[PDB]
A paper describes a structure:
After the recognition, eIF2 is released from the ribosomes as the guanosine disphosphate (GDP)-bound form and regenerated by its specific guanine nucleotide exchange factor, eIF2B, a heterodecameric complex of two copies each of the α-, β-, γ-, δ-, and ε-subunits. Various stressors such as viral infection lead to the suppression of cap-dependent translation and the activation of the integrated stress response (ISR), since the stress-induced phosphorylated eukaryotic translation initiation factor 2 [eIF2(αP)] tightly binds to eIF2B to prevent it from exchanging guanine nucleotide molecules on its substrate, unphosphorylated eIF2. Sandfly fever Sicilian virus (SFSV) evades this cap-dependent translation suppression through the interaction between its nonstructural protein NSs and host eIF2B. Here, our cryo-electron microscopy (cryo-EM) analysis reveals that SFSV NSs binds to the α-subunit of eIF2B in a competitive manner with eIF2(αP).
We also analyzed the mixture of human eIF2B, unphosphorylated eIF2, and SFSV NSs, and obtained the cryo-EM structures of the eIF2B•SFSV NSs•unphosphorylated eIF2 ternary complex. Most of the ternary complex particles contained only one molecule of eIF2, but small fractions of those containing two eIF2 molecules were also observed. There are no notable structural differences in eIF2B or SFSV NSs between these two ternary complexes. These structures revealed that SFSV NSs and the unphosphorylated eIF2 can bind to eIF2B simultaneously and there is no direct interaction between them. The SFSV NSs binding does not seem to affect the unphosphorylated eIF2α binding, because SFSV NSs-bound eIF2B is able to accommodate eIF2 without major conformational changes. The only exception is the quite small closure of the interface for unphosphorylated eIF2, as observed in the comparison of the eIF2B•unphosphorylated eIF2 complex structure with the eIF2B apo structure. The conformation of eIF2 is essentially the same as that in the eIF2B•unphosphorylated eIF2 complex structures and the switch 1 region in the nucleotide-binding eIF2γ subunit is widely open as well. Therefore, it seems to be trapped in the nucleotide-free state. The binding of SFSV NSs sterically blocks the inhibitory interaction between eIF2B and eIF2(αP), whereas it is compatible with the catalytic interaction between eIF2B and unphosphorylated eIF2. As a result, eIF2B suppresses the inhibitory effect of eIF2(αP) and continues to catalyze nucleotide exchange on residual unphosphorylated eIF2, even in the presence of high levels of eIF2(αP).
Numbering used by the authors:
A (entry chain N): 3 to 277
B (entry chain G): 166 to 521
C (entry chain J): 40 to 241
D (entry chain C): 8 to 99, 106 to 115, 127 to 351
E (entry chain H): 166 to 520
The structure:
């Protein structure tokens, strides 16, 4: 049903780790290590904050997840002690990114297991040992390696095929990765009123529109439609919105230059934006 | 595990949430004679609480601390475990069972919190015998400084207020008040004492037995007649079972009545209590947090007939036996502690300075 | 939904303020040490107007000078103000004809004089007007704003008293007239022949 | 930054024009976020420079709407945090003891502000977790107006206890009716009354639980209109009164140090415009805030526990600096 | 037989002993259109009580006495019978029906008692027409000398207590207070008046509309803001619907609240009432005997919604709108009657001297 995200069982010291608070005691706060198959953990009260704090409940908030560093580990007694004073905002950000990517990877693996109908928890543990943790061991970078490998598999299915799990299981995993690691959807729209009330009005307007549309490269066809008489909407349904905005800006600049050259009228009704 | 004590008799609707047991029903009837839950430091204290062998709050705290010293001495760590946390996790059932036998007081709550803090403060590297010895030493130091020295300092402070030829009114069996009066009489102060008692405990007679044994002139009367005797009373002195952060005084049932009538008769009111008894929790009435004792103690034999004999056979009839009540701060003029002579409004301030 | 716009006529085409108007525009008179233009601009800004056009003909120089120093003319204001000057203006009809000639408005603008003191949020009325337009496919062209008041109130001066007759089910105006000096009022039969369900005279 | 100025202008316009955000908790959170952005996205070298900038912004925001004190309280809290951080990073209270005995700051300030937001998040649950110890079975609890804190308090209390709640509508803004439905949606057996009848029913009320808008230094209160009458009736009947108030509602000001303490709105709500002629001579006042002296307050409940009014001066002294009461 | 009125809505547990009728439900649905069980005057008066067309205590008493005069004029004794007790026996069902339409007040109770005592005292040797004329004359004399002359004397007495430049606070609608203020202003005094109103009747706008028509300066505000304006108030004048034997003042809901807040602000409180409203019964609070109005009156349309529209649909929801409440004597300083200005504890003495 569920297991630790990483093959490693006890996280090392000085490693920022996600926790979920469960209860409050005198010694400190009880948490579950969500990504280590919910092992019990402690946060000492003397380490909650650098300031003088009298109540644990001032920042415990049972039921709310948190990012805590590990200050001491004792594998013999199953005792892990954590901390909140040491963690920096940047460390929290990178740990949260790690947690999100690990959650995505585990969602993919859990979907694969459910598709395979592997009712045995041992079968799911073996699935973790074989399918996803192989890339984790290969890349020598826990967390990020699995997500990078899954992205590459969504790009090139060679990585997914290289796994030695099964044939039908490989197909199920590929389908799950495609349904999960390929959520590409974007449509950048903009509005601009291009019209020249001069001698060759319609001709100049058509020429400027064609010149602007000529800047639309492959996999980014800028289609211009006449929503109104004087205003025109340009739509480019392409991924990479960061580059799409620059492309739309370049097209708008080209259209404005073409309109100004022929002594016409060009107005930017709205900047490019997603739909 | 330990069973649950059965509530005895119907309760008032306003007090439906509080438990109410009977002295006849002892929980030990459902527990092993060679106590298998844990060692029987539980059962001795629990029986002496349920049967009311010890009543005074200081007496209860001392008995609990002695029993818990025995607990610590007999306790041994399990392999592959940490004492600083296992000790508290094991001690929590002791507190649960003790609450089942009889609800705890503020003094015992403070003692439990202090000992839990001490256990938590114990490091994970020190040896077992050293930890046990230092825990026992800490308990001894706590007892000493929080009871004996506090009582001596409070007696020294109260010696100033007690003037010659005056009348001092007390209430119930309180060790601090009796010791204060005895020490004041020792130093040559000449005065009278008026004792006010209330049913059904009638523990006020206790202090009377002290006062005659100290040669102090005394007088004794029940609570309702207090309004008759107050005009000749010059000072009212009351012990307290607890102090709250709002300045109110949680004490025996009759304390608030005496304070109110004393204010109505223009008589100063003194409340003597130790700092360790101060409790951070607050309440505005005796309904939210109290303790209902056995109602069967209410039955009395007047003439040859007991009116409340078969009270259970009347469905509409209800009996309540309150043991605690709250006196509002505005009716209190003194709190006498080892820190000195303070107003009630300064109760939280002490809680701030003793916490660190 | 295009951004909302509002036209703000800054001249009353009537000489009701001689000799005060002879040396100061009516729109610039201080009500409570504050110009009426400031009041109406604040009201427009409050109700979410993002573009305001002010038309000034009489003594437009003083209005220009005073307005350019106002808060609304600051670059930080969310109410974009555009000032138009034309001595050819003689009535509100000329102002609207000029607006249509230059086609500043896109759809559903606000018409209001420059001496209007109000704190009305017309979001509900605007939504009702847009819904009526959408369902009826561009039949309704105007939506007045009226406030309930007793006829004895001082605000209801005899110069601006108005009596209206509307359908109570859809707030569809059927008749509208002034009541200056009239001891009786007239209503054509047509009002009843169409809306047989009911008619309310207000 | 341009966007910083844009957000500041939007915030001050929203505060000065009407309501927003709906709950004072959201307003405090937005103020703290704006102050954090001011501290981060601005240039400053000395602590004095940052304090002067914060003081100017706080003066502007307070002048936007004086009747709203939460923004000022957050600004003063930030100023106190800055003072403490500078003092303990450079060196190491105004008491008698003091009388008789004479580079990386920004990250610490940001961390302190984040801690402040974290403890702001759970304030309502911190208050509501201790409801069970203040309510007994078959109690009668009376409430005035509308208050989310008291609503959550009563909902948490009613989970394991049964009692009766009587709500008085706060005319003219009859927001108590929301209680009338909301508690009814939880099945608490509530009753609705007009706020002309408090004393008449007051003798049959065991306890009164109310919220508040502001807490002054001496322990007074700024509450909804008519709360002074309710407190007076409670004092007359000596019924204990509870003020469920979060920690961030302690203004270090004093009652009579200023005016405009009451907030006046259009008299349309009290007397409708349709009266006509009589409005031409009749003067109408509609204050929406009333002053409650600390004598009539029995207990304060906050995210840190219970307290007496007489102790308020300490808490106000533990969150602000005396040299910042002028702002 | 007269049918009983059915209670509307679920009543509060503490007020289970009081009735609660809706304005929509009227008994006339189950009565003959040509009135046979009761006199047409009785049914008309009950209709205009149950619909709230008569609200003032003095107005209610006057209307009741006029209707009773109509009935007496229309009455005819039966054979083998005499007027003395037959008249009372016939009148009892009319009073029961009137109570069914709306609970009786102190003024109506006293009027009924006085009329019963007068009818019972009618000699057997009296002739029917002569007895009817005598009863009509007695009712007219009682109305005159117990309302009009009493109000004139009360206004004359209260004129002295009012000085130039002071501020007087009133509450609700009451003819006696308005007459006192108008006559005091007419006599030459100059002062402001502060009017306090309350939901849902909002009857204060009545007296305000009078004061503006008299040229008196005035101010208006709802009851909760009274604590705001009491610092500038010098005297408080209230109208009382009933005076109890123990000195308690049985009046409109907001009376006791205003008296308490005024006493807290250290402002004297004045009460003007007529001797005929002095009841002999006593009550220590507003729970033992009160009046429950239509609960639907509490609904107010704020914004675009009525928050209490389907209040019945919430099972645990109850609405409560009292009409009367009791002010303890310690919060009152004056009782102003035709006898003069008396302490609030002297009510029983008057009760003794009027019999």
């Amino acid at each position: 049903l569920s297991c630790r995200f990483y093959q490693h069982k006890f996280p090392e010291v000085e490693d920022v780790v996600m926790v979920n608070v469960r209860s409050i005691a005198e010694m400190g706060a009880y948490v579950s290590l969500l990504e280590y198959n919910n092992i019990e953990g402690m946060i000492l009260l003397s380490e909650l904050s650098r300031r003088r704090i009298r109540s644990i409940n001032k920042l415990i908030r049972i039921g709310r997840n948190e990012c805590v560093v590990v200050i001491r580990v004792d594998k013999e007694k199953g005792y892990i002690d954590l901390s909140k004073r040491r963690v920096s905002p940047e460390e929290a950000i990178k740990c949260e990114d790690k947690f999100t990517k690990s959650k995505t990877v585990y969602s993919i693996l859990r979907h694969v297991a459910e598709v395979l109908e592997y009712t045995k928890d041992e079968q799911l543990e073996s699935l973790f040992q074989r399918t996803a943790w192989v890339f984790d061991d290969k890349y020598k970078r826990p967390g990020y390696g699995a997500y990078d490998a899954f992205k590459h598999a969504v790009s090139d299915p060679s990585i997914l095929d290289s796994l030695d799990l099964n044939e039908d299981e490989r197909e199920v995993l590929i389908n799950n990765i495609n349904r999960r690691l390929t959520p590409q959807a974007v449509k950048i729209r903009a509005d601009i009123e291009v019209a020249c009330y001069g001698y060759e009005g319609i001709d100049a307007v058509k020429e400027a529109l064609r010149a602007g549309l000529n800047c639309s490269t492959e996999n980014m066809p800028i289609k211009i439609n006449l929503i109104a008489p004087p205003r025109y909407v340009m739509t480019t349904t392409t991924l990479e919105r960061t580059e799409g905005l620059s492309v739309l800006s370049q097209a708008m600049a080209v259209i404005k230059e073409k309109i100004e050259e022929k002594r016409g009228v060009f107005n930017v009704q709205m900047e490019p934006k997603v739909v | 595990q330990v069973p649950t004590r059965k509530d005895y008799g119907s309760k008032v609707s306003l007090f439906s949430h509080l438990p109410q047991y009977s002295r006849q029903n002892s929980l030990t009837q459902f527990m092993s004679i060679p106590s298998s839950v844990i060692h029987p430091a539980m059962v001795r204290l629990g029986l002496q609480y349920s049967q009311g062998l010890v009543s005074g709050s200081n007496a209860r705290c001392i008995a609990l601390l002695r029993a818990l010293q025995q607990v610590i001495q007999d306790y041994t760590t399990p392999p592959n475990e940490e004492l600083s946390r296992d000790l508290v996790n094991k001690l929590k059932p002791y507190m649960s069972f003790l609450t089942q036998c009889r609800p705890l007081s503020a003094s015992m709550h403070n003692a439990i919190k202090f000992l839990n803090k001490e256990i938590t403060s114990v490091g994970s590297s020190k040896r077992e015998e050293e930890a046990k010895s230092e825990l026992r030493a800490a308990i001894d130091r706590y007892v000493q400084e929080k009871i004996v020295l506090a009582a001596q300092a409070i007696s020294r402070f109260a010696y100033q207020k007690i003037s010659n030829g005056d009348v001092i009114l007390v209430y119930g069996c309180s060790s601090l008040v009796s010791r204060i009066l005895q020490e004041a009489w020792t130093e040559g102060r000449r005065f009278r004492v008026v004792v006010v008692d209330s049913r059904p405990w009638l523990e006020g007679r206790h202090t009377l037995r002290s006062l005659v044994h100290a040669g102090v002139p005394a007088s004794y009367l029940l609570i309702p007649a207090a309004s008759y005797v107050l005009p000749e009373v010059s000072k009212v002195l009351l012990g307290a079972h607890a102090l709250l952060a709002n300045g109110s005084v949680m004490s025996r049932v009759g304390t608030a009545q005496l304070a109110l009538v004393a204010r109505a008769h223009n008589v100063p009111v003194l409340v003597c209590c130790e700092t360790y008894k101060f409790c951070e929790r607050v309440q505005t009435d005796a309904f939210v947090s109290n303790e209902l004792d056995d109602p069967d103690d209410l039955q009395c034999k007047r003439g040859e007939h007991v009116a409340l004999a078969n009270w259970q056979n009347h469905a509409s009839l209800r009996l309540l036996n309150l043991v605690y009540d709250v006196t509002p701060p505005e009716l209190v003029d003194l709190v006498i502690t080892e820190l000195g002579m303070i107003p009630c409004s300064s109760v939280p301030v002490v809680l701030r300075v003793k916490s660190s | 939904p295009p951004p909302l716009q509002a036209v703000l006529v800054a001249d009353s085409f009537d000489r009701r303020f001689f000799p005060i108007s002879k040396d100061q525009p009516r729109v610039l008179l201080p009500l409570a040490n504050v110009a009426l233009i400031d009041y109406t601009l604040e009201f427009l800004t409050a109700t979410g107007v993002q573009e305001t056009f002010v038309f000034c003909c009489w003594k437009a120089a003083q209005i220009k000078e005073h307005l350019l120093k106002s808060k609304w003319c600051r670059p930080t204001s969310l109410n974009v103000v555009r000032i138009i000057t034309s001595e050819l203006y003689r009535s509100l009809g000329d102002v609207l004809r000029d607006v249509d000639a230059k086609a500043l408005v896109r759809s559903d603008f606000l018409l209001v004089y420059g001496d209007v003191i109000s704190n009305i949020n017309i979001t509900r009325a605007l939504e009702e007007h847009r819904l009526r337009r959408k369902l009826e496919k561009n039949v309704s062209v105007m939506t007045m704003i009226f406030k309930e008041s007793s006829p004895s109130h001082p605000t209801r001066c005899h110069e601006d008293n108005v009596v209206v007759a509307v359908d109570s089910t859809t707030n569809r105006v059927l008749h509208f007239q002034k009541t200056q000096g009239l001891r009786r009022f007239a209503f054509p039969l047509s009002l009843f022949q169409g809306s047989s369900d009911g008619v309310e005279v207000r | 930054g341009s966007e910083l100025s844009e957000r500041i202008e939007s915030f001050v316009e929203t505060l000065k024009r009407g309501g927003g955000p709906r709950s004072s908790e959201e307003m405090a959170r937005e103020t703290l976020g704006l102050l954090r952005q001011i501290i981060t996205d601005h240039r400053w070298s000395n602590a004095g420079e940052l304090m002067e900038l914060i003081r100017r912004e706080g003066r502007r925001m307070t002048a936007a709407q004086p009747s709203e004190t939460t923004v000022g309280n957050m600004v003063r809290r930030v100023l106190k945090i800055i003072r403490e951080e500078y003092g303990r990073l450079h060196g190491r209270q105004e008491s008698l003891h003091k009388l008789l005995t004479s580079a990386q700051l920004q990250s610490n300030i940001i961390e302190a502000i984040n801690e402040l937001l974290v403890e702001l998040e759970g304030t309502m649950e911190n208050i509501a977790a201790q409801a069970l110890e203040h309510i007994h079975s078959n109690e009668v609890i009376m409430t005035i107006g509308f208050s989310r804190t008291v609503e959550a308090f009563l909902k948490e209390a009613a989970r394991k206890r049964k009692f009766h709640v009587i709500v008085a509508e706060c005319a003219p803004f009859c927001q108590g009716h929301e209680m009338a439905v909301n508690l009814s949606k939880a099945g608490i057996e509530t009753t609705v009354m007009t706020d002309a009848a408090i004393f008449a029913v007051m003798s049959r009320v065991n306890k009164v639980i109310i919220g508040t808008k502001t807490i002054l230094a001496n322990g007074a209160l700024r509450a909804v209109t008519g709360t002074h009458t309710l407190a007076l009736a409670a004092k007359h009947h000596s019924t204990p009164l509870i003020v469920c108030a979060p920690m961030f509602k302690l203004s270090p000001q004093f009652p009579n140090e200023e005016d405009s303490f009451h907030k006046f709105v259009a008299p349309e709500e009290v007397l409708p415009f349709t009266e006509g002629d009589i409005l031409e001579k009749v003067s109408v006042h509609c204050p929406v805030f009333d002053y409650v002296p600390p004598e009539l307050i029995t207990l304060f409940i906050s995210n840190i526990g219970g307290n007496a009014p007489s102790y308020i001066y300490r808490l106000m002294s533990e969150l602000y600096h005396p040299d910042d009461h002028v702002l």
